[PDB]
Amino acid sequence: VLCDVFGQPITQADISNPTRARDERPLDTIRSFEYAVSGDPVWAQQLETPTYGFRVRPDFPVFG
């Protein structure tokens, strides 16, 4: 019954914010905030959550 901006649905809800997806990375939130002001289809086509997920990108350097 719940849905996000751009109409895409939601299945796993966040623990602290029940109205947001669990695996959404911060850049997607920034783009959604920008889209909320002015209607632009260009903001919706730059999402990257499903292809990468919440894990870090490959070839991320190592610290120590």
Binding site: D14, I15, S16, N17, R25, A36, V56, F60, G64
Partner: protein, 1406 residues
């Protein structure tokens, strides 16, 4: 363009991309278990900071500056904590701070290694370091108030991260682990000490303040390496015994109830006063002692007599004046003894006092010895030049000791001599002794002002002291009023009266000695401030037109940043677009009519065929007036030049809200009427509004417009919100004015230009916290949604609650953020941007601080402005925002590498940043806050405490002269006062003392001196009445007998009264001048008016009036008129200005309202305060008995007589009567309520009336028994009455003092009741005594017109008729007027009879 963060993402020189910054946050959240929705918020915060700092410098410098400010720099708090705790370098830091002037395994090597390590970091490691700290800070809840605990947690987490345990672990740590394991136990410890659980609810349990561990007590544990060692686990092992990589994982097993403890305890206020300000009494009392001792040879001259003029040996004179050093050495010892009760005995730093005590007593012994040698009879009987040499040396030694103890601060007297390995300082130097020094002329001015003040004061006081007291001392100390005395004690009761009078005179002058320095300080400050004007070139003689004519050039050169632009356009076309904007802005607020507009606007009318004729200046240059005048005046002072709006930083406005009104309802408009009251206050605006209404037009829109109009003139949140939204339009106006190429390149597309301007305005300007948004009434939510519809860019924060996950467990509490662009759910609520879970209820203590704390995580930018619920702002003042932000001295400075190897600490120029900027029409209420500096050292709140904390930590405070803010005591026993008093240098200490506490001390000293003078006057008048007098003038020879044989000289005693009266009159005039200055530029029922001044110079006033009357009747002196007039004016001033008090109807309505209103070691310390009452009562009793002693007349021998038993009956009879009445009330069915319910529901009033009646009757009996002896003498009763009252007060005070430290508790209740009844009885008499004096003033019929004349001197001078009421109200009014006139006249008749009856009795009775 069209990017989230243009300053960083659109630059090709950025060292790290945004996609490489997001992954660091993601990895940290995975590894440490932070909440995700807080991680998003902190990512946004960090990116906004990077965008803000990159708009005026390179990204490479921005990242390095952020790292230096947050972790590794000299301005960072983390480095200070590290060096103070881990490396144990506090003593070296204090020593370096002590000797900075001479400078400008060791501290230098440690700093070198730290800089070398910090100099070779990659940018990614810097980003990780900053991100970890921000993530830790975002979750801290109430731990944000304690910076050092957070630093310790951050260090533990950083140590755990780099270990192989974290790197080789496979699965991520479960979400929410940090908050559950680390923060919740500390929150529970904080909460469980204030509240206790009963019946399932939390109730604020009560205990003395010394058994509650506040926030400051937790913080101070993490300042020392010894405090860290006290952390213990459950199994019994210490935390520090584990290796460095495992302390984080076991941080959830610490039991905090066995660790924290109290570090500072309070006591009686006089101990704090003595300890904090020891440097002042040393420089006062020591000088007074020398002045008095040098001019009183009688007390140490062998067989002294002025007639034989035998001067004492000079050796005695020099030895006596050398005792000044001993007094100073004793004061320091006494001050050190008191300090031993403030700090724990085993806490670090407490061992300095024991070392200091031995040095102080050694100095005392050194100062004491040689004087004892000189005074010895061996060198008194035989003269020796060696004794004279010893006295001459000791004089200079004493002077040097006085100076040394008057200059050096108490904390740090003998640090360099100890050289011990133990703590050499009582308090931490890093966190409590980091004052910022002064540089330049301002440093020299501070020395010069105080040197001038003290040089003037010490030279002026001696001239008056040498002569006002030389003769009275000589006359009084040698006279002998011999008598036979009273043989129950002896003749000692009469021979010591002159010496008692002399002692009282000396005591009064000692107090008078303290009032001159404030006077001289005021005078010198005024003179220097006036003189500085000629260097500043301030001109007041110039005409206002000479200011108005220069306005456009000042606007062009100080408001616009036109220096950076190429000069393509003329100044006038730029000035016009701003002047017209301001003028039109004032018009739309209904402040100007249509005809007034064209007198001020720039016009386009003239011919366009020639380009020069295009524009013409207004005739003005060839509430609106107040604002224009202030703007024109403020543009005259020098202003820093601004930056272009594409280079300015970001700032936020923060507002708290609790139960305030958002909008006025229709009932508030049409009911009582507010609308008529507003219309008769603001007419012209009302005609303007109604005229404007029909231009565009149940009348919904008209009703809404009326609601808005009424709201804008009343105290509402909408007024404040609409006031401060002028920041956005000012920024848009400046942006479009300062570069016309962007305007031109759109070519008529207005919508695109508006969108582009709004996009720019959103970046630079940003918040209201409503803690009750989930609890509003429906009409409150209806108003709240209106604000979001009117201003889409407004943000709101509120608290939200959920039912517990597991059954029977505390509910969860969250914090949410919404704004005007959020989607509306089908429930009617808006979708939150963020939700962050808290560990519990955040509001523990009352105040706005806990409201601001939970909403502080949502701010953005670099600077914060703190406002309140009701404040106002204007468009003209918002245009100068860019110049105000330049006061922090960070916008146009050179960028350097903080980690360069060659740089030394003394060569750095950015050691002390600016923390607070406060507006004025060096403490003050803060307006603008440096966010980075303040949020890393605690919260933002309490204002004066925030100022003290910022000063102590090492920041600076400045004031802005060209900005105006639309704004519209004895608890200071704190740590801050102690730290400031015991560690500041002398000049700063004097400047601080003479501003805040010196005013209150002066107000106390004046009141004390008045009572001392009254006691001296009573005793002197008694002696003068008893003695035989002689009169003489200054034309006297050296010594000759007076015409009356055998009289006693007392004329200098009379002269002293005149001199003291003149001095006190001058002091009162100087203290009253500011009230006149404040008041003379602007031209209530009796119960509350009386209650306001009750206990404030009214009871003491009457007590002084009684003694003044006695001193007047017994003996007459001319200067007593001034005191009579002053006291009468003080008593009767408040009733003069009461509106329409002359009217009979108002008078008796007030009378009715008044009448119906009537209807361990602590043991001796808590009771040592009774002595001053005992001394005063003893003085009054001696004065009373002296007249009874019959000293003036030749006394009969061996006849005994006494009157003390009369006095004890006088004092004890009313208390016994009251106790008997209470016993009778107990006997009359106190075990059955209904009898009292049926007879008198408030039966205590009957007992109160009986007590008042018997109290009057006992005084009547006093008068009768006294006038049995005296049929024509009156002076003799008043001193006895005063003695009786003072003994009553002493008994009550001693009873209360013993009470402060079955019928056991009923005994306490009865002890309270007995003083309560006497207090009520006194108040009853005092009220009528006040009222009867005003009777003749209301009798004359002409008082009405004369009082109404004063209405013309008053500014408003507006009166409207009272609302209409029915005739029955008039009938009741006249009936009550009749009743209360009769009652008033009957009471006055009783009072008059009470006096006239004994007058007849004195004749008819024996």
């Amino acid at each position: 363009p069209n990017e989230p963060y243009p300053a960083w993402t659109a630059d090709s020189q950025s060292p790290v991309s945004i996609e490489q910054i997001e992954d660091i946050f993601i990895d940290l959240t995975n590894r440490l278990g932070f909440q995700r929705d807080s991680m998003r918020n902190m990512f946004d915060h960090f990116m906004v900071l990077l965008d803000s700092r990159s708009s005026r410098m390179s990204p490479d410098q921005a990242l390095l500056s952020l790292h230096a400010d947050y972790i590794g720099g000299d301005t960072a708090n983390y480095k200070k904590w590290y060096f103070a705790a881990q490396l144990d370098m506090d003593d070296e830091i204090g020593f370096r701070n002590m000797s900075l002037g001479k400078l400008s395994n060791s501290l230098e090597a440690a700093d070198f290694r730290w800089k070398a390590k910090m100099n070779q970091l990659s940018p990614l490691e810097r980003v990780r370091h900053i991100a970890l700290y921000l993530l830790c800070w975002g979750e801290a809840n109430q731990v944000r108030f304690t910076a050092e605990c957070l630093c310790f947690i951050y260090k533990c987490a950083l140590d755990y991260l780099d270990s192989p345990l974290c790197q080789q672990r496979q699965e991520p740590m479960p979400e929410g682990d940090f908050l559950n394991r680390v923060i919740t136990p500390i929150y529970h410890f904080i909460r469980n000490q204030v509240y206790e659980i009963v019946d399932g609810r939390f109730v604020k349990r009560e205990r003395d303040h010394n058994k509650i561990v506040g926030y400051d007590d937790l913080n101070q544990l993490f300042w020392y390496p010894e405090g860290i060692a006290k952390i213990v686990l459950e199994d019994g092992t210490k935390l520090i015994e584990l290796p460095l990589e495992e302390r984080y994982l076991r941080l959830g097993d610490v039991v905090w109830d066995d660790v924290f403890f109290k570090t500072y305890k309070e006591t009686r206020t006089w101990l704090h006063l003595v300890t904090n300000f020891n440097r002042i009494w040393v420089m006062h009392i020591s000088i007074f002692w020398m002045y008095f001792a040098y001019n009183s040879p009688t007390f140490y001259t062998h067989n002294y007599q002025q007639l034989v003029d035998n001067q004492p040996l000079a050796a005695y004179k020099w030895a006596s004046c050398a005792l000044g050093g001993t007094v100073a050495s004793l004061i320091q010892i006494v001050a050190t003894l008191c300090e031993w009760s403030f700090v724990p005995r085993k806490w670090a730093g407490a061992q300095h006092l024991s070392r200091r005590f031995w040095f102080l007593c050694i100095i005392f012994g050194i100062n004491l010895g040689p004087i004892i040698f000189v005074f010895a009879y061996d060198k008194d009987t035989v003269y020796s030049t060696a004794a004279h040499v010893v006295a001459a040396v000791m004089f200079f030694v004493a002077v040097a000791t006085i100076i040394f103890f008057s200059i050096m601060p108490l904390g740090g007297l003998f640090t360099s001599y100890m050289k011990k390995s133990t703590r050499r300082y009582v308090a931490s130097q890093t966190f409590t002794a980091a004052f910022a020094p002064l540089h330049g002329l301002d440093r020299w001015m501070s020395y010069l002002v105080w040197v001038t003040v003290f040089a003037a004061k010490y030279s002026e006081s001696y001239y008056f002291l040498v002569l006002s007291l030389r003769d009275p001392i000589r006359i009084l100390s040698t006279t002998a009023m011999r008598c036979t005395g009273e043989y129950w004690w002896g003749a000692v009761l009469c021979k010591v009266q002159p010496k008692i009078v002399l002692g009282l005179v000396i005591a009064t002058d000692f107090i008078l000695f303290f009032l001159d320095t404030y006077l001289w300080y005021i005078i010198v400050n005024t003179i220097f401030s006036v003189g500085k004007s000629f260097y500043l070139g301030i001109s007041i003689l110039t005409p206002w037109r000479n200011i108005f004519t220069r306005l456009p050039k000042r606007i062009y050169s100080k408001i616009l940043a036109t220096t950076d632009m190429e000069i393509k356009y003329k100044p006038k076309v730029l000035i016009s677009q701003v002047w017209n904007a301001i003028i039109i802005s004032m018009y739309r607020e209904h402040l100007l009519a249509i005809d007034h507009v064209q007198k001020l606007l720039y016009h386009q009318v003239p011919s366009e065929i020639e380009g020069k004729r295009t524009l013409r200046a207004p005739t003005f240059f060839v509430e609106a007036e107040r604002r224009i005048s202030f703007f024109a005046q403020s543009l005259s002072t020098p202003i820093p030049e601004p930056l272009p709006v594409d280079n300015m930083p970001t700032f936020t406005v923060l507002t708290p809200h609790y139960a305030e009104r958002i909008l006025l309802s229709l009932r508030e408009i049409i009911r009582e009427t507010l609308l008529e009251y507003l219309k008769q206050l603001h007419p012209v605006e009302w005609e303007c509004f109604v005229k404007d209404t029909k231009i565009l037009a149940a009348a919904p829109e008209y009703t809404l417009r009326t609601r808005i109009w009424a709201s804008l003139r009343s105290q509402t949140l909408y007024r404040t919100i609409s006031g401060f939204m002028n920041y956005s339009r000012a920024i848009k106006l400046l942006y479009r004015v300062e570069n016309p190429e962007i305007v031109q390149m759109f070519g008529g597309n207005a919508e695109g230009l508006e969108r582009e301007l709004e996009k720019m305005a959103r970046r630079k300007f940003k918040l209201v916290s409503m803690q009750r948004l989930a609890k509003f009434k429906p009409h409150e939510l209806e108003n709240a949604e209106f604000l979001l519809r009117a201003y889409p860019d407004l943000q709101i924060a509120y608290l939200d609650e959920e039912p517990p996950l597991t059954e029977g467990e505390e509910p969860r509490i969250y914090s949410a953020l919404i704004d005007g662009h959020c989607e509306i759910l089908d429930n009617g609520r808006r979708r939150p941007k963020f939700r962050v879970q808290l560990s519990g209820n955040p509001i523990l203590g009352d105040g706005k601080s806990d409201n601001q704390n939970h909403a502080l995580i949502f701010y953005r930018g670099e600077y914060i402005q703190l406002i309140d619920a009701n404040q106002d702002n204007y468009l003209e003042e918002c245009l100068k925002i860019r110049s105000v932000l330049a006061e922090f001295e960070e916008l146009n400075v050179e960028q350097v590498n903080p980690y360069a190897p060659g740089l030394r600490y003394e060569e750095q120029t950015t050691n002390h940043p600016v923390a607070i900027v406060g507006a004025r029409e060096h403490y003050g209420h803060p307006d603008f806050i440096n966010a980075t500096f303040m949020t890393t050292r605690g919260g933002v709140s309490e204002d004066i405490y925030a100022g003290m904390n910022a000063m102590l930590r090492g920041g600076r405070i400045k004031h802005c002269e060209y900005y105006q803010c639309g704004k519209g005591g004895e608890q200071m026993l704190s740590r801050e006062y102690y730290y400031l008093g015991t560690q500041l240098p002398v000049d700063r200490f004097l400047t601080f003392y003479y501003a805040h506490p010196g005013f209150h001390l002066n107000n106390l000293f004046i009141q004390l001196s008045l009572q001392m003078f009254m006691l001296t006057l009573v005793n002197l008048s008694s002696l003068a009445h008893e003695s035989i007098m002689c009169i003489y003038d200054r034309n006297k020879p050296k010594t000759d007998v007076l015409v009356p044989i055998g009289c006693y000289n007392f004329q200098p005693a009379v002269d002293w009264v005149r001199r003291y009266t003149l001095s006190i009159f001058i002091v009162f005039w100087i203290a009253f001048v500011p009230i006149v200055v404040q008041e003379l530029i602007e031209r209530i029922p009796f119960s509350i008016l009386y209650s306001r001044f009750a206990g404030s110079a009214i009871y003491m006033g009457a007590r002084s009036m009684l003694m003044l009357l006695f001193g007047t009747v017994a003996h007459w002196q001319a200067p007593l008129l001034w005191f009579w007039a002053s006291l009468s004016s003080l008593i009767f001033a408040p009733f003069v200005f009461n509106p329409h008090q002359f009217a009979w109807e108002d008078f008796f309505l007030d009378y009715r309202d008044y009448i119906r209103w009537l209807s361990a070691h602590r043991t001796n310390l808590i009771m040592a305060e009774i002595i001053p009452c005992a001394i005063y009562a003893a003085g009054c009793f001696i004065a009373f008995t002296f007249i009874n002693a019959q000293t003036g007349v030749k006394t009969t021998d061996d006849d005994r007589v006494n009157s003390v038993l009369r006095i004890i009956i006088c004092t004890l009879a009313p208390i016994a009567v009251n106790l008997g009445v209470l016993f009778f009330c107990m006997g009359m069915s106190c075990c059955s309520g209904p009898l009292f319910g049926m007879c008198c529901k408030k039966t205590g009033s009957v007992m109160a009336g009986i007590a008042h009646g018997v109290a009057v009757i006992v005084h009547i009996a006093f008068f009768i028994v006294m006038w049995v002896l005296e049929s024509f003498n009156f002076v003799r009763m008043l001193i006895g009455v005063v003695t009786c009252i003072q003994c009553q007060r002493l008994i009550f005070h001693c009873m209360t003092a013993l009470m402060l430290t079955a019928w056991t508790q009923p005994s306490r209740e009865l002890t309270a009741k007995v003083i309560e009844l006497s207090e009520f009885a006194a108040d009853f008499v005092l009220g009528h005594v006040i009222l009867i004096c005003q009777l003749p003033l209301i009798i004359i019929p002409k008082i009405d017109k004369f009082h109404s004349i004063m209405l013309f001197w008053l500014k408003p001078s507006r009166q409207i008729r009272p609302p209409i009421y029915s005739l029955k109200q008039t009938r009741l009014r006249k009936r009550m007027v009749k009743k209360y006139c009769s009652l008033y006249f009957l009471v006055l008749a009783i009072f008059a009879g009470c006096i006239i009856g004994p007058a007849v009795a004195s004749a008819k009775i024996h």
